[PDB]
Scaffold this active site. Structure first.
Site, short mmCIF file in Angstrom:
data_model
loop_
_atom_site.label_atom_id
_atom_site.label_comp_id
_atom_site.label_asym_id
_atom_site.label_seq_id
_atom_site.Cartn_x
_atom_site.Cartn_y
_atom_site.Cartn_z
N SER A 122 0.81 -1.22 0.00
CA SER A 122 0.00 0.00 0.00
C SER A 122 0.86 1.29 0.00
CB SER A 122 -1.00 -0.08 1.15
OG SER A 122 -2.05 0.86 0.97
N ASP A 239 -10.07 -4.24 -5.06
CA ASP A 239 -9.42 -3.37 -4.11
C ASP A 239 -10.03 -1.96 -4.22
OD1 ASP A 239 -7.60 -1.76 -2.66
OD2 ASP A 239 -5.86 -3.01 -3.25
N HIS A 269 -8.04 -5.40 -0.39
CA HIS A 269 -6.74 -4.72 -0.33
C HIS A 269 -5.60 -5.46 0.35
CE1 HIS A 269 -4.12 -1.34 -0.35
NE2 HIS A 269 -4.12 -1.18 0.98
O1 LIG Z 1 -2.78 -4.00 6.73
C1 LIG Z 1 -3.26 -2.90 6.48
C2 LIG Z 1 -4.32 -2.28 7.35
O2 LIG Z 1 -5.15 -1.33 6.66
C3 LIG Z 1 -4.39 -0.31 6.01
C4 LIG Z 1 -5.20 0.84 5.47
C5 LIG Z 1 -4.30 1.91 4.84
N1 LIG Z 1 -3.32 1.31 3.91
C6 LIG Z 1 -2.62 2.21 3.11
O3 LIG Z 1 -1.40 2.31 3.10
N2 LIG Z 1 -3.40 2.95 2.28
C7 LIG Z 1 -2.82 4.13 1.63
C8 LIG Z 1 -3.82 5.28 1.56
C9 LIG Z 1 -5.12 4.85 0.88
C10 LIG Z 1 -6.16 5.98 0.87
C11 LIG Z 1 -5.78 7.16 0.02
C12 LIG Z 1 -6.08 8.45 0.41
C13 LIG Z 1 -5.67 9.54 -0.33
C14 LIG Z 1 -4.95 9.36 -1.50
C15 LIG Z 1 -4.68 10.52 -2.40
F1 LIG Z 1 -5.66 10.70 -3.30
F2 LIG Z 1 -4.55 11.66 -1.73
F3 LIG Z 1 -3.57 10.36 -3.11
C16 LIG Z 1 -4.62 8.07 -1.89
C17 LIG Z 1 -5.05 6.99 -1.15
C18 LIG Z 1 -5.67 3.59 1.55
C19 LIG Z 1 -4.61 2.49 1.58
C20 LIG Z 1 -2.59 0.15 4.43
C21 LIG Z 1 -3.55 -0.95 4.90
N3 LIG Z 1 -2.94 -2.20 5.38
#
Ligand code: A1IA2
Ligand code: NA
Ligand code: NA
Length: 295
Positions: A122, A239, A269
């Protein structure tokens, strides 16, 4: 006689002197984890966790990797888990990349001549991509589990609008809603575990942090023609957090001569914490891919 100030402690009040740690370039303590085999390691591998979570969630993956004679190492990113920093705040997304490079450089001093791999999930996958793109030819390979390449289209619109409101005005507490835990995994027990872990930040994403995630997506896009590192990319087709279109874009635009994509039909995800059929396959595929590139 002057006296030394009270020991520096984690956000959970544990002295850093009692834990593996590293001090970053900004003077912040990062909590570290190590899983080393009994023999001489064949290679090193850094594990890069995602937003809101921490390195403790990679225990089973790390033990599998250590079982292949790799020395696995990780740290909680700034603002996460047992590391210092305001929760889910980062001055610039490059701080995460800078800190991974410091830890990799430190480990390569203690274990010279060993190949080094990256594993990222992620946001941690976007960090792994930017880390490999900054040092072309340095890393032996990268394993990406649902990396943040393209955000969900609706969420990208939400944060572009919010970023434009804070870019134009002064709103330090502005935040979006929290990440819906039900979209993390079809494995309900893993959703419940995520909701029970006190080291996970489940608050709404602050708009300043959202801006850095938009920076990460933009920087990842610009880095893809510079990316030559071998990689294995694992992505669920359902996802709702890291759009599967991003995985296809990474396969298409990376210059890497060794690139493989595996799609998990219907998976959510967190592929390494999904239904057992998916998780068992994810562990098996990473085991085969790293074993083939460490033999
Ligand atoms: O084991 C796990 C537990 O749950 C976690 C939720 C968040 N995860 C993340 O690293 N993200 C990254 C950010 C995402 C949401 C998001 C928000 C804003 C932007 C943007 F538009 F600003 F770029 C991009 C993605 C969701 C997944 C990791 C996941 N892994
Ligand atoms: Na320093
Ligand atoms: Na060595």
């Amino acid at each position: 006689m002057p006296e030394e100030s009270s020991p520096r402690r984690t956000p959970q009040s544990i002295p850093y002197q009692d834990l593996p740690h590293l001090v970053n370039a900004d003077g912040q303590y990062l909590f570290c984890r190590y899983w080393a085999p009994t023999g001489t390691p064949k290679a090193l591998i850094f594990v890069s966790h995602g937003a809101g979570e921490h390195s403790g969630r990679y225990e089973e993956l790390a033990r599998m990797l250590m079982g292949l004679d790799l020395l696995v190492f990780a740290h909680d990113h700034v603002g996460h888990g047992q590391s210092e920093g305001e929760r889910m705040v980062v001055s610039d997304f490059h701080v995460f990349v800078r800190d991974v490079l410091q830890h990799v450089d430190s480990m390569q001093k203690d274990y010279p001549g060993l190949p080094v791999f990256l594993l990222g999930h992620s946001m941690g996958g976007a960090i792994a991509i930017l880390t490999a793109a900054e040092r072309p030819g340095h890393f032996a390979g990268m394993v990406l589990i649902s990396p943040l390449v393209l955000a969900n289209p609706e969420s990208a619109t939400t944060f572009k609008v919010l970023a434009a409101k804070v870019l134009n005005s002064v709103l330090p507490n502005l935040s979006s809603g929290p990440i819906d835990s039900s979209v993390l995994s079809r494995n309900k027990t893993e959703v419940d575990i995520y909701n029970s872990d006190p080291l996970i930040c489940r608050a709404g994403l602050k708009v300043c942090f959202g801006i850095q995630l938009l920076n990460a997506v933009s920087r990842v896009e610009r880095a893809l023609p510079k990316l030559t590192v071998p990689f294995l990319l694992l992505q669920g087709s359902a996802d709702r957090l890291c759009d599967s279109k991003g995985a296809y874009l990474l396969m298409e635009l990376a210059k890497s001569q060794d690139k493989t994509l595996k799609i998990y039909e219907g998976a959510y995800h967190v592929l390494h914490k999904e239904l057992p059929e998916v998780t068992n396959s994810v562990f098996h595929e990473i085991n085969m891919w790293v074993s083939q590139r460490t033999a």
